[PDB]
Design an enzyme around this catalytic site. Structure first.
Site, PDB file in Angstrom:
ATOM      1  N   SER A  46       0.787  -1.222   0.000  1.00 54.53           N
ATOM      2  CA  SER A  46       0.000   0.000   0.000  1.00 54.53           C
ATOM      3  C   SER A  46       0.823   1.277   0.000  1.00 54.53           C
ATOM      4  O   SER A  46       0.236   2.361  -0.081  1.00 54.53           O
ATOM      5  CB  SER A  46      -0.956   0.017   1.188  1.00 54.53           C
ATOM      6  OG  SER A  46      -2.038  -0.810   0.956  1.00 54.53           O
ATOM      7  N   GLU A 144      -4.424  -7.618  -5.810  1.00 57.92           N
ATOM      8  CA  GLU A 144      -3.449  -8.501  -6.446  1.00 57.92           C
ATOM      9  C   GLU A 144      -2.025  -7.972  -6.308  1.00 57.92           C
ATOM     10  O   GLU A 144      -1.072  -8.756  -6.255  1.00 57.92           O
ATOM     11  CB  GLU A 144      -3.786  -8.673  -7.934  1.00 57.92           C
ATOM     12  CG  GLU A 144      -4.996  -9.550  -8.232  1.00 57.92           C
ATOM     13  CD  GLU A 144      -6.319  -8.824  -8.076  1.00 57.92           C
ATOM     14  OE1 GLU A 144      -6.319  -7.618  -7.750  1.00 57.92           O
ATOM     15  OE2 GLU A 144      -7.369  -9.467  -8.300  1.00 57.92           O
TER      16      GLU A 144
END
Length: 269
Positions: A46, A144
């Site tokens: 992230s 993913e």
């Protein structure tokens, strides 16, 4: 000449962790650096969401009404861990609010909406190329992109390129001054990094950061700009990975690596 003037026990730290730690830290005053596995690739996880918000801010320099544009979305957009955007499903949020949520809460739905606006992984990659980062690559969408497969270059960068790009965006000239300060303010408001670089930074120093946590392969990270009082800011990146899919990440190892980096730069903390 100014790289690793003082050695630090990064090897012992990563061995105790059971994986690999990559660190690149820059003293923006002198140019001195601390560098350990700094040109190896590590999964972004992230942490891409910080650069995504910077790319949005860059676009806003050409599109004066972009940040206040209201974005409505359906329930199908709410993917796991969307703590802010789930509260505005029935109302919508502005581009700026989505960007803040992506940075400060790592909000997944917000990041997906913004990534679509930018033209997908290739569009974010193109933004990073436009600031001179030839290492960064985003290839896939969430979730993913968190697979963190050993040896897979997709959705990776290096600690060095992350630091170099972060410096350009927060302290350099890659963004115009209002947008630069907005990026800094979003990083300063991050809520997910209290146990990472921030845990190595004294409470009386300003700091902004963006975390990443892939959830597999001991893979997690943080990058930050730190303003120690009375001297130039420090930019640094700490990335980890480990060989086995079920290896656990460690926030404490990230904090410890950040402490070693500050010590290596001679920054009293």
């Amino acid at each position: 000449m100014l790289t690793n003037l003082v050695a630090e026990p990064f090897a012992k730290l990563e061995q105790d962790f059971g994986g690999s730690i990559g660190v690149y830290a820059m003293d923006t005053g002198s140019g001195a650096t601390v560098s350990y596995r700094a040109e190896e690739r590590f999964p972004l996880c992230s942490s891409f969401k910080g650069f995504l918000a910077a790319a949005v801010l860059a676009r806003s320099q050409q599109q004066a009404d972009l940040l206040d544009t209201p974005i409505r979305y359906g329930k199908n957009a709410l993917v796991p861990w969307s703590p802010i955007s789930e509260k505005y499903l029935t109302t919508g949020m502005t581009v700026a609010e989505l960007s803040a949520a992506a940075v400060q809460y790592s909000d997944n739905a917000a990041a997906n909406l913004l990534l679509k606006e930018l033209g997908g992984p290739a569009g974010l990659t193109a933004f990073m190329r436009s600031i001179g980062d030839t290492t960064f690559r985003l290839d896939r969408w969430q979730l993913e992109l968190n697979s963190a497969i050993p040896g897979d270059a997709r959705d990776t960068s290096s600690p060095r390129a992350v630091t170099e790009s972060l410096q350009k965006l927060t302290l350099g000239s890659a963004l115009a001054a209002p947008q630069r300060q907005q990026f800094v303010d979003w990083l300063k408001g991050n809520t997910t990094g209290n146990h990472r670089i921030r845990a190595a930074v004294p409470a009386d120093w300003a700091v902004g950061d963006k975390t990443g946590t892939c959830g597999v392969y001991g893979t997690a990270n943080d990058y930050a700009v730190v303003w120690p009082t009375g001297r130039a800011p420090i930019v640094l990146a700490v990335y980890t990975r480990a060989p086995n899919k079920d290896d656990k990440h460690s926030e404490a190892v990230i904090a410890a690596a950040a402490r070693l980096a500050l010590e290596g730069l001679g920054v009293n903390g």
